[PDB]
């Protein structure tokens, strides 16, 4: 997909206020709590048996920052999401064996975190811009699956 | 299967929403029309501009139906029976759209409930809305 | 998004022996039967009370012919489906108000019809080619929505 | 929610799918892997080569489970209870994939039982597979 100029600005504008590490851990954690079957890929992270366990798990937090960090770097290329994420796409398919549907779920969870964190400033139009972005990244991450 | 615990934190989150339910319902609608334009195909008779009284009106009905489902959360199929009948035999909204509005309702609650929207409550609310969606599409065929 | 040279070949090869007219009415008919809410757009077609009534309705067949006709022509423009249905997409959004999900459902009903109609000949590899085609067409028809 | 007619159609159609369990189940799986490649992410521990023993055996396991559900269509929750727990607590396949396999099963049935795959039967089978999917994912969260 292709974001319009007035949406690319809303995304960047809002992202400049974000503490990536904080949001990443929060988003990955909620993913594992809201859609617990996603925990199938993190058996190595240890205990994820309860909401508090997941949100307090150091390995979940650490992985959250790497994921959202790669996501963040991707926002610098909103016009070339597929090419920017081509390598991680192959990794998730060939080595991680991660169903791309998972990227869609994380994307929606991320949107919920941004709203929870920003409240009123996460306006309908800003959400719209981000929905386009997460859909793009998910589509980009799924593009190299075979 | 909404657990007795999902119901409790749903009742708690919705209790906090209180008299803002209507306003939040309309906001969730606008969020959906902007985030997923295809949902607009179901409201050709409505003016979908921000501030639209039709959207505001619909929003209150949508909120009311939700407030009612929460009041009768242990037996939602009844509380929503009339409505389920309406979407299934007349409105005929493709089932896929219920997750879109549900997601937007979640985003709305998240944007208004800093303290209440915990991971556990976020989880329970999601299951609740998926449950409502299931009930409303249960008579489609 | 991308079919291989052999995939497009298989598609056209199998389609070349398809009476676009007759299969069209069959696909649209089953759509209205399997996913009855899709009938919301055809209250003017007349009797659609029974599977037999729906299947034998001349208006349904007439529309099925019209619908599959554009589909077939699209099979001649696989390297660019968006442009091919661009104007058709705008029409379905602005005047017809057809939720694009309807395109996806018709696509899967059409695949089933092809399988029913061609049996053994509709092998797994052939199906895979058509799945790409119906997804491509659906996405193209949805691309201009706003 | 399966009407007596759906149950009748399902039992009748699934009739011939009996002896060809492993074959049709295997074919349905192969159709899914080729048509929807992402589904292969759940079988990295399998040789997904055309005709592999693993795919043939799993095909039979799936078809037999459906034959069971059809046999006890009037008490599907209990009949599939063990399978439901397995997919919910261990396999944890994203719900979206059940629709994909369900579609490939319908395609398989359509290509093998032309006489039985009428529009009404088609609709009943689709509802049937969606029900089974619902039961199989009912304990996910
Ligand atoms: C915005 C989407 C996503 C991005 C950009 C992303 C990015 C990354 C990156 C960069 C790594 C490498 C970490 C490192 O080795 O330092 C990684 C690993 C991984 N990702 Fe993704 N990821 C995303 C979504 C997901 C989702 C939704 C899941 C699963 C539900 C997932 C599962 C994994 C797993 C299992 C690993 C391996 C972690 C380990 O054991 O070290 N990813 N991802
Ligand atoms: C969260 C689930 C939903 C709830 C609780 C809900 C609730 C309602 C209620 C209570 C009404 C009006 C009742 C009446 O006047 O008799 C209504 C109307 C309607 N709903 Fe739903 N709805 C939901 C989801 C959807 C979705 C996803 C769509 C489409 C994107 C949709 C489209 C419609 C339409 C087109 C109307 C007609 C509005 C009018 O003409 O005034 N609904 N809904
Ligand atoms: C493979 C996808 C489809 C294609 C390529 C397609 C193509 C067409 C074409 C060529 C027209 C004529 C436009 C004109 O020149 O005036 C049309 C009309 C229409 N389509 Fe689509 N269509 C598709 C699927 C659907 C589906 C599944 C629905 C709804 C369930 C839908 C509902 C309509 C309606 C209501 C009309 C107007 C019919 C009339 O005025 O007689 N279409 N479509
Ligand atoms: C019609 C729905 C389905 C049915 C009836 C079904 C049935 C089964 C059965 C009977 C087993 C064997 C359990 C045992 O050994 O006792 C199983 C295993 C499994 N299923 Fe499901 N399943 C369904 C859908 C899915 C889907 C959609 C996927 C993923 C795309 C999936 C992935 C798996 C996996 C990974 C296994 C493990 C196989 C192995 O390691 O041998 N299933 N399923
Ligand atoms: C009964 C089955 C039933 O009534 C039913 C079958 C199929 C659908 O299709 C909707 C597709 C869209 C979506 O799933 O999101 C519906 Cl809505 C209902 C039944 N349900 C559970 C057990 N038996
Ligand atoms: C049970 C609630 C429950 O345990 C549950 C909630 C939500 C989902 O989301 C997946 C839906 C995907 C789709 O729409 O196809 C699952 Cl899998 C389980 C409950 N309460 C009332 C009805 N059901």
Residue of A nearest to B28 (CA): A124
Torsional sign, CA A34, B121, A122, A63: negative
* Cα of C41 from ligand 3 centre, angstroms: 10
Q: Reduced to 3 states, what is the DSSP secondary structure of residue C144?
A: coil
- Determined by X-ray
CATH number for the domain spanning A38: value is 1.10.490.10
Give the single-character DSSP code of A91.
H
Q: How many CB atoms lie within 10 A of CB D40?
A: 18
Integer CA distances (angstroms), D80 to D83, D88, D105, D132, D134, in order: 5, 12, 18, 8, 11
Sequence-distant (6+) residues with CB within 8 A of D33 are D39, D40, D43, D48
Residue (of B135, B118, B140) closest to B65 by Cα position: B135
Helix axes D119-137 and D4-13, enclosed angle (nearest 10): 100
Which tokens sit at A122?
A: 């996460």
* Cα of B37 from ligand 1 centre, angstroms: 30
Q: Residue D109, class by beta-carbon neighbours within 10 Å (0-12 exposed, 13-18 middle, 19+ buried)?
A: buried
The Cα D106–Cα D28 span in angstroms is 8
Question: Nearest 5°: phi and psi at A19?
Answer: -100, 95
Subunits adjacent to chain B (3 or more Cβ pairs under 8 Å): A, C, D
Cβ contact A116–B111 (<8 Å): yes
Chosen for mutation from B41, B84, B141 (greatest number of chain C CBs closer than 10 Å) is: B41
Enumerate helices (H) and strands (E) in chain C, giving the number of each: 7, 0
* N-terminal to C-terminal alpha carbon distance within chain A: 21
Which tokens sit at A127?
A: 């959400």
Residue (of A102, A103, A59, A64) closest to A85 by Cα position: A103
Q: Identify whether the C-beta of residue C146 lies closer than 8 Å to the C-beta of residue C105.
A: no
The Cα B3–Cα D110 span in angstroms is 39
* Cα of B133 from ligand 4 centre, angstroms: 26
Resolution, Å (one decimal)? 1.9
**CA dihedral in degrees (C1, C7, C10, C13; nearest 10)?**
60
Helix axes D96-112 and D21-35, enclosed angle (nearest 10): 120
> Which DSSP string do the residues of C16-71 spell out, in sequence order?
TTS-HHHHHHHHHHHHHHHSGGGGGG-TTS---SSHHHHHH-HHHHHHHHHHHHHH
Residue (of D81, D69, D56, D57) closest to D14 by Cα position: D69
Which tokens sit at C130?
A: 């058509």
Q: Identify whether the C-beta of residue D25 lies closer than 8 Å to the C-beta of residue D137.
A: no
Nearest CB to B140; choose among C37, C97, C146: C37
Residue A12, H or E segment: helix A5-15
Chosen for mutation from D96, D119, D123, D141 (greatest number of chain B CBs closer than 10 Å) is: D141
The Cα A31–Cα A48 span in angstroms is 11
Give the single-character DSSP code of B140.
-
Q: How many CB atoms lie within 10 A of CB B130?
A: 15
* N-terminal to C-terminal alpha carbon distance within chain D: 21
Can you tell me which atom of ligand 4 is nearest the CA of D32? Answer: 30
How distant is the alpha carbon of residue B131 from its chain centre?
A: 10
Residue (of A115, A135, A137, A144) closest to A68 by Cα position: A137
Can you tell me which atom of ligand 5 is nearest the CA of B140? Answer: 17
Which tokens sit at C6?
A: 């052999």
Say whether residue C56 is in contact with chain D using an 8 A CB cutoff: no
How distant is the alpha carbon of residue A68 from its chain centre?
A: 6
Q: Identify whether the C-beta of residue B92 lies closer than 8 Å to the C-beta of residue B26.
A: no
The Cα C87–Cα C67 span in angstroms is 14
Q: Residue A43, class by beta-carbon neighbours within 10 Å (0-12 exposed, 13-18 middle, 19+ buried)?
A: exposed
The Cα B89–Cα D118 span in angstroms is 24
Does C97 count as an annotated binding residue? no
How distant is the alpha carbon of residue D37 from its chain centre?
A: 17
Q: Identify whether the C-beta of residue A98 lies closer than 8 Å to the C-beta of residue A53.
A: no
Q: Identify whether the C-beta of residue D55 lies closer than 8 Å to the C-beta of residue D124.
A: no
Please state the length of chain A: 146
B137 lines ligand 5 (CB under 6 A): yes
Half-sphere exposure of B85 (CA within 13 A, CB side): 6
Which tokens sit at D97?
A: 């994939």
Q: Residue B16, class by beta-carbon neighbours within 10 Å (0-12 exposed, 13-18 middle, 19+ buried)?
A: middle
The Cα C145–Cα B38 span in angstroms is 7
Residue (of D55, D70, D52, D49) closest to D24 by Cα position: D55
Residue (of A132, A114, A106, A87) closest to A19 by Cα position: A114
Residue of D nearest to C122 (CA): D111
Instruction: Please name the residue that has the structure tokens 């029900």.
Output: D131
> Buried (b) or exposed (e) across C95-129, using 16+ Cβ within 10 A?
eeebbbbbbbbbbbbbbbbbbbbbeeebbbebbbb
Cβ contact D112–C119 (<8 Å): yes
CATH architecture of D1-141: Orthogonal Bundle (1.10)
Residue of A nearest to D37 (CA): A146
Q: How many CB atoms lie within 10 A of CB B1?
A: 9
How distant is the alpha carbon of residue D10 from its chain centre?
A: 13
The Cα B58–Cα B35 span in angstroms is 18
Chain C residues touching residue D105 (CB < 8 angstroms): none
The Cα C113–Cα C119 span in angstroms is 9
Sequence-distant (6+) residues with CB within 8 A of C91 are none
Pocket test for ligand 6, best of B127, B132, B135, B136 (most atoms within 8 A of CB): B127
> Which DSSP string do the residues of A72-113 spell out, in sequence order?
HHHGGGTT-HHHHSHHHHHHHHHTS---THHHHHHHHHHHHH
The closest residue, in CA terms, to atom 6 on ligand 5 is D127
Integer CA distances (angstroms), B64 to B113, B115, B135, in order: 19, 23, 16
Which tokens sit at D69?
A: 């559900």
Torsional sign, CA B16, B18, B19, B25: positive
Overall domain count for chain A:
1
Question: Nearest 5°: phi and psi at A85?
Answer: -105, 10
The Cα D131–Cα D109 span in angstroms is 17
Give the residue numbers spanning the domain of A142. 1-146
The domain segmentation of chain B, as residue ranges, is: 1-141
Sequence-distant (6+) residues with CB within 8 A of C124 are D27, D30, D31, D34, D35
Sequence-distant (6+) residues with CB within 8 A of B66 are B14, B21, B25, B105, B132
The closest residue, in CA terms, to atom 15 on ligand 5 is B95
């Amino acid at each position: 997909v292709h974001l319009t100029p007035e949406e690319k600005s809303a995304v960047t504008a809002l992202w400049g206020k974000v503490n990536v590490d904080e949001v990443g851990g929060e988003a990955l954690g909620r993913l594992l709590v809201v859609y617990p079957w996603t925990q199938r890929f993190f058996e190595s992270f240890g205990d994820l048996s309860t909401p508090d366990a997941v949100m307090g798990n150091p390995k979940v937090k650490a992985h959250g920052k790497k994921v959202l960090g790669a996501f963040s770097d991707g926002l610098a290329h909103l016009d070339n999401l597929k090419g920017t994420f081509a390598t991680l796409s192959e990794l998730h398919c060939d080595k991680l064996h991660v169903d791309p549907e998972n990227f869609r779920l994380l994307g929606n969870v991320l949107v919920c975190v941004l709203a929870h964190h920003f409240g009123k400033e996460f306006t309908p139009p800003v959400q719209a811009a981000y929905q386009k972005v997460v859909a793009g990244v998910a589509n980009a991450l799924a593009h190299k699956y075979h | 299967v909404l657990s007795p615990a999902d119901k409790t934190n749903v009742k708690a989150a919705w209790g906090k929403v209180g008299a803002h339910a209507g306003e939040y319902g309309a906001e969730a609608l606008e969020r959906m029309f902007l985030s997923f334009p295809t949902t607009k195909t179901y409201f050709p008779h409505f003016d979908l501009s921000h501030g639209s009284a039709q959207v505001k009106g619909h929003g209150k009905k949508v909120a009311d139906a939700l407030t009612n489902a929460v009041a009768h959360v242990d037996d939602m199929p009844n509380a929503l029976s009339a409505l389920s009948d309406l979407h299934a035999h007349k409105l005929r909204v493709d089932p896929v759209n219920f997750k879109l509005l549900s997601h937007c309702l979640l985003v709305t609650l998240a944007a208004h409930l800093p303290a209440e929207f915990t991971p556990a409550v976020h989880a329970s609310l999601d299951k609740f809305l998926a449950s409502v969606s299931t009930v409303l599409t249960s008579k489609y065929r």
